[PDB]
Design a protein around this ligand. Sequence first.
Ligand code: FMN
Length: 169
Amino acid sequence: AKIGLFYGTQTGVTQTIAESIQQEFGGESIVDLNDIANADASDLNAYDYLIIGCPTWNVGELQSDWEGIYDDLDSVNFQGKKVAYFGAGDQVGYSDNFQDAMGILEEKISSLGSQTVGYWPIEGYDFNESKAVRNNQFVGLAIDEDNQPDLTKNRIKTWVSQLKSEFGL
Ligand SMILES: Cc1cc2nc3c(=O)[nH]c(=O)nc-3n(C[C@H](O)[C@H](O)[C@H](O)COP(=O)(O)O)c2cc1C
C-alpha cells in the first residue's frame, strides 16, 4: 500500500477511528495500519503519503506513545511527503486544549518539510482554543466520541472522500 497510517491510543478510541478510516479508503490493500507503539520513527520513511492519528491527553499533551517517539521525528526525511492528521478529543471538558496533540505533531512534521493536506472546517464544534487551528480550519479531522458520537461516521466518510483526491486516488 502507498499510504501508511500510524496512530497512538490510550483508551482505544483513536484506534477505532483509524480502523474506520482504513476501511473507508478501501481496506488494507490501500492503507497500511500501524500502532506507533510497535514502530520505529524510520518506518515513516517508506511512504510518500502518511496519515497521523493522535488523541490529546492530560490537558494538551501528546498521547504517551507519540511523546516517546517525538524527538526521533527529526531523523525522518519528511521532504516531499503529504501528511494528513486526525485525532480524538473532548471539546467540552478541555475547551482550551481541544485537539492540541494533533496541532503539536502537525507543527513539528510540517516544519520538517512535509505538506499538510486534509484540512477540516470548524463548523459544528464549540471550543475556546486549539493548537490545531490554522486560518479558521482544523489541520486535520477532529473527532469527539465523548460529546459528538453521532457525527463521527459522517465526519470520517466526508474527510476520506476529500483525502482520496490529494493522495492520487
Ligand atoms: C483526564 C483526561 C484528559 C484529557 N485531556 C484532553 C485535552 O487536553 N484535549 C482534548 O482535546 N481532549 C482531552 N481528553 C479527551 C480524550 O482525548 C478523548 O477521551 C479521546 O477519545 C481519547 O482517545 P484514546 O482512546 O484514543 O486515547 C482527555 C481525556 C481525559 C480522560
